[PDB]
């Protein structure tokens, strides 16, 4: 079943204060809230077990990979309470907004894009490591907490590479960060998500991936068909690098992300983390006057 799922004497409505909406995705609403025992800030994710179905499975296969991680680099998993029909999914609060967020004001620069892939970096590192694929890497994606700290979310339709299984072919993701394998189905594993890194990179730098005007269908063959995108503009040719680097046709010859940390364009570039905080400010300022 669900892990980490409480029975029903469990009232969520009174060991959870909720203090704020503060999102609302697809699934349900997304509380800023406050574990009263422990008196620990947390987010809380609250889904209409009735007014949904097939989103079902996907929370369910979330809240399983979540359940299996204990990194810094992903968002940790608190347990599930059920209220009538209403899950409540607990977890830890990231109260500075997506990477996606972040551009929404204006764009980043290459110290501020290079501190953000390293840290996914990590994440997927650790991901990679566990035989875990997130299949869904995007600015979207990535969550940061208030003090700068960068994380992984959303796996959603994250896969496990596991020991009679060391390949995935299941179509999944988002379209313009898809590898071109992924797409045409073919076995795969965690050299997808290099891929999606490198449209993510693409992402930071110019704010949407490649093709993102166009219809998502057309995508679809364009991805395996092209050459693959490249970083235009006036970037440093480390970031182009990288990019190039990460966006290879061919799966196996895409470097891991342990040695993607060592690329010069992260290694001449990447600062501390709460150099974010600055970032993440300016994001608030924009928010409080839209």
Sequence with gaps: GLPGMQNLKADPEELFTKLEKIGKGSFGEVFKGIDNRTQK???????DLEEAEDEIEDIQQEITVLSQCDS?????YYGSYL???KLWIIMEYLGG?????????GPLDETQIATILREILKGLDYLHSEKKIHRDIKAANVLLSEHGEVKLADFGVAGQLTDTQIKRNTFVGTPFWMAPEVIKQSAYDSKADIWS?????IELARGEPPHSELHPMKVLFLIPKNNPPTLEGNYSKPLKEFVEACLNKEPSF??????????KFILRNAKKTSYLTEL?????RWKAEQ
């Design 83 to 85: 209220k009538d029909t």
């Design 280 to 284: 993440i400010d300016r994001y608030k």
């Design 41 to 47: 800030v947390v987010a809380i994710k609250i889904i």
């Design 97 to 105: 907004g997506s990477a996606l967020d972040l551009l929404e004001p």
């Design 197 to 201: 890194l490198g449209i993510t990179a």
């Design 72 to 76: 810094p680099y992903v968002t940790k």
């Design 254 to 263: 895409r470097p891991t992300a342990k040695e993607l940390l060592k690329h």
